[PDB]
Amino acid sequence: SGEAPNQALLRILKETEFKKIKVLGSGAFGTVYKGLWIPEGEKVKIPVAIKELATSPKANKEILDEAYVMASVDNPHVCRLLGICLTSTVQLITQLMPFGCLLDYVREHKDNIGSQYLLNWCVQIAKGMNYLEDRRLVHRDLAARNVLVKTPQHVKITDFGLAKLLGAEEKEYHAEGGKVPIKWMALESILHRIYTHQSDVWSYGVTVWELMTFGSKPYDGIPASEISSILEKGERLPQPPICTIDVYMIMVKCWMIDADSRPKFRELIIEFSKMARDPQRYLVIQGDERMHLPDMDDVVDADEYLI
Numbered sequence: 001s002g003e004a005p006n007q008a009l010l011r012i013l014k015e016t017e018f019k020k021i022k023v024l025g026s027g028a029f030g031t032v033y034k035g036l037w038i039p040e041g042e043k044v045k046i047p048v049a050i051k052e053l054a055t056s057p058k059a060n061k062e063i064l065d066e067a068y069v070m071a072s073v074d075n076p077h078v079c080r081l082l083g084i085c086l087t088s089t090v091q092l093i094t095q096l097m098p099f100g101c102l103l104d105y106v107r108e109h110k111d112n113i114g115s116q117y118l119l120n121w122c123v124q125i126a127k128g129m130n131y132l133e134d135r136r137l138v139h140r141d142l143a144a145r146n147v148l149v150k151t152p153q154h155v156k157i158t159d160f161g162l163a164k165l166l167g168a169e170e171k172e173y174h175a176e177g178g179k180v181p182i183k184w185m186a187l188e189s190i191l192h193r194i195y196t197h198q199s200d201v202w203s204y205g206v207t208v209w210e211l212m213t214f215g216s217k218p219y220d221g222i223p224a225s226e227i228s229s230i231l232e233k234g235e236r237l238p239q240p241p242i243c244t245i246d247v248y249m250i251m252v253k254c255w256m257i258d259a260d261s262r263p264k265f266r267e268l269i270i271e272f273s274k275m276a277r278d279p280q281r282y283l284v285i286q287g288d289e290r291m292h293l294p295d296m297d298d299v300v301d302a303d304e305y306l307i
């Protein structure tokens with residue numbers, strides 16, 4: 001066969017199995033709800049988020065593309081769809097990520113986040129992305145806002161509203177118009193609308209910068225139309241205060257002009273894993289030693305060695 005059959009199950013869930021309990025988020029697109037899912041006859045209550053959007057035939061087409069992608073992934077560091085409800089406007093049903101997105105989380109808990117948590121998040125995000133790359137999937141909107149927190153110890157990548165699947169012999173995605181976030185975009189993406197796993201790596205680099213600065217805005221103040229010019233001249237995001245040159249050098253590499261010179265996600269996993277073994281040698285954080293939220297230099301556990 002040209003390509004491999006996608007045999008994922010799309011699950012359809014009766015409206016009467018859910019119970020919206022509270023708006024969680026709203027704006028633009030639609031709103032996201034917190035709820036409970038109680039499958040029929042089972043004795044189980046599953047905390048869920050329910051994501052919708054008035055009915056426009058343009059919207060439903062796009063939310064179903066998103067369900068398609070979310071239903072095709074299965075990994076501890078990715079959010080998968082639990083199912084869809086076919087109400088007048090189609091709802092996506094996902095597992096509830098109780099602590100919200102990671103951007104707001106690091107802003108809110110700035111003063112209580114130790115280096116161990118920061119480096120572990122980098123390892124986990126890299127594992128999710130490496131998985132998405134295994135599934136031949138280019139995310140195209142990786143950012144701190146699109147990483148969610150199941151616990152402070154455990155995060156997952158979300159938001160496949162722009163994700164694209166690539167043939168077994170296709171190696172780029174050539175996009176069109178439509179608002180993409182320029183400040184997380186690789187250079188090739190901004191000049192040529194080309195996207196690859198390697199341009200996800202660039203976006204990974206920006207996301208890591210967001211975390212290290214406890215939630216700063218990339219090129220704060222700068223109008224998007226300028227970014228391509230800044231980047232072309234050779235400018236990048238500044239080294240975060242807590243960052244050793246070891247860590248910042250990794251961010252810089254994710255931002256090479258030559259996309260094949262950037263690190264692979266499976267390398268990002270290895271490098272950050274090693275740093276996670278001695279956190280304080282790589283991030284310098286005032287008060288690090290006592291923080292709480294609810295030669296073997298080269299040793300890597302096999303679980304983190306992925307080839």
Ligand SMILES: CC(=O)N1CC[C@H](Nc2nc(Nc3ccc(N4CCN(C)CC4)cc3)c3ncn(C(C)C)c3n2)C1
Nearest residue numbers: 024025032049079094095096097098099100101145158
């Ligand atoms: C950037 C943006 O527009 N967002 C990010 C969050 C939301 N999308 C979302 N949220 C989920 N859960 C959640 C959300 C906020 C909290 N609190 C509420 C109380 N605040 C003091 C602190 C945070 C708690 C939980 C969520 N769970 C699963 N998903 C799916 C769609 C992956 C979620 N999406 C919309």
